[PDB]
Amino acid sequence: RVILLKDYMMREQLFLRDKRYNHITITSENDIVEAYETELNRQVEIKTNPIFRVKPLFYGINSTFPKIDFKLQNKDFSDTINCGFLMDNTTFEMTERGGSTHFNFIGLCGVNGSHIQTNYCDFSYNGNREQLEEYNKDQNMYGDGLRIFNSSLTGNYMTVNRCGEI
């Protein structure tokens, strides 16, 4: 059990690859874990029919990811491609207590048969909804939430409000 103290402010990216971390659980003394400007910008490029480069805070490829028991809430709006979670060929679970929020590009991305368990969670305000003007159907409308390609997802009672684009 990894407990993030109330003094912890997220400023780095956690990259797990080929790690069978079924047992580990990540919990926070706070309800929300804020995410500030990451020191080192490590981006992962997704080779898919639309090519889009992402900078994820939590990234797991070809491996099970530790259970998440907090809510990521972005606090850096300078980077236009940051993303809360990029799960790639990964079974991913969240503990009903949180979900990514306020990220610029994508709240949570599931690729390559990455089953997601997020349930009762909240993925809101992710994207370009801050800038766009109401009642216009033709404008550059950026961002996205729960971008799921070729992956399963079991999430009920979620709330996803005010997200730019899908």
DSSP string, 103-140: -SSEEEEEESS--B---S-B--S-SSTTTPPTT-SSS-
Report the C-alpha gap between 83 and 70 in whole angstroms.
16
93 binds its own copies (CB under 8 A): yes
Q: After which residues is the chain broken (C to N over 2.5 A)?
A: none
Q: How far is the CB of 139 from its own copies (least distance, A)?
A: 4
List the x/- string, 94-133, binding to its own copies by CB under 8 A. Answer: -xxx---xx--------xxx-x-x-xx-x-x-----xx-x
**Cα separation, 154 vs 148, whole angstroms:** 12
165 lies in the site for its own copies, by CB under 8 A: no
Q: Is 41 in the site for its own copies (CB under 8 A)?
A: yes
Mask 130-149, x = binds its own copies (CB under 8 A)? xx-xx-x-xxx-x------x
Cβ 150 to its own copies, closest distance in Å?
4
Q: Which residues are CB-contacts of 121 (< 8 A; sequence separation ≥ 6)?
A: 71, 94, 96, 98, 99, 155, 158
Maximum separation of any 2 CA atoms in the chain, in Å: 48
Nearest distance, CB of residue 52 and its own copies, angstroms:
8
Candidate list 2, 12, 14, 37; residue touching its own copies; CB under 8 A: 37
Residues of span 14-33 touching its own copies by CB under 8 A: 18-20, 22-23, 27, 29-32
- SS3 of 36, please? coil
Among positions 48-77, residues that touch its own copies (CB under 8 A) are 48-49, 51, 53, 62-64, 67, 73, 75, 77
